[PDB]
């Protein structure tokens, strides 16, 4: 046959994506039965079919992740894999609001005597 183009795979639902995967896995095994003691243009079909299964598998996984992320919006606790992964050291630094707090007596001085803008003439 031919490739399964990724262009039209995006405008599908989950069920028909799972259906197409059914035949795709089928004849790959069936065609492997008779590949022995023969070799021709059919050898291009195994490399054709193997990659075709890969494309649809990624699409199904990607579609599930996007919809799952919508569910956990506006939630305090969300699963580990959906949390951002930056670095072990970067996940334990103080937040911006915590590191910017100041004491009440320090703010009083900074309000009335800040750094001024000045110039001195020759």
């Amino acid at each position: 046959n031919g490739k399964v183009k990724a262009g039209q795979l995006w405008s599908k639902n989950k069920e028909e994506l799972t259906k197409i995967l059914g035949e795709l896995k089928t004849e790959l095994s069936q065609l492997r039965i008779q590949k022995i003691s023969s070799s021709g243009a059919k050898l291009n079909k195994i490399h054709d079919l193997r990659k075709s299964i890969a494309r649809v598998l990624t699409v199904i996984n990607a579609k599930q992740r996007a919809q799952l992320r919508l569910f956990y919006k506006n939630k305090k606790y969300l699963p580990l894999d959906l949390r951002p992964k930056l670095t072990r050291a970067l996940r334990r630094r103080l937040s911006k609001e915590d590191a910017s707090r100041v004491l009440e007596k320090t703010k009083k001085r900074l309000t009335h005597f800040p750094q001024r803008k000045y110039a001195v003439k020759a």
Partner: protein
């Protein structure tokens, strides 16, 4: 001693180790003579500089640490570029 006594050698002091793959696991002692298994630390000493370089970082696959420099250059961003399809 000599050839006559060399024929009596059909036993094994050491076997394969689960952490370093070398045949340096004492059967009776149950400790590896190269990587220090089952201790948490890995054996390493400063009186031999050649031994340290034989198992230093960067002599293997580096499955995860090899892609970090590229990620830092872009500032550890997430998302997709503007109007990508998907």
């Amino acid at each position: 001693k000599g050839t006559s006594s060399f024929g009596k050698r059909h036993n094994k002091t050491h076997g394969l180790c689960r952490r370093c793959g070398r045949r340096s696991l004492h059967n009776q002692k149950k400790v590896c003579a190269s990587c220090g298994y089952p201790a948490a630390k890995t054996r390493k000493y400063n009186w031999s500089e050649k031994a340290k370089r034989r198992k230093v970082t960067g002599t293997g696959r580096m499955r995860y640490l090899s892609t970090v420099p590229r990620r830092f250059k872009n500032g550890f961003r997430t998302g997709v570029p503007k109007g990508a399809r998907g």
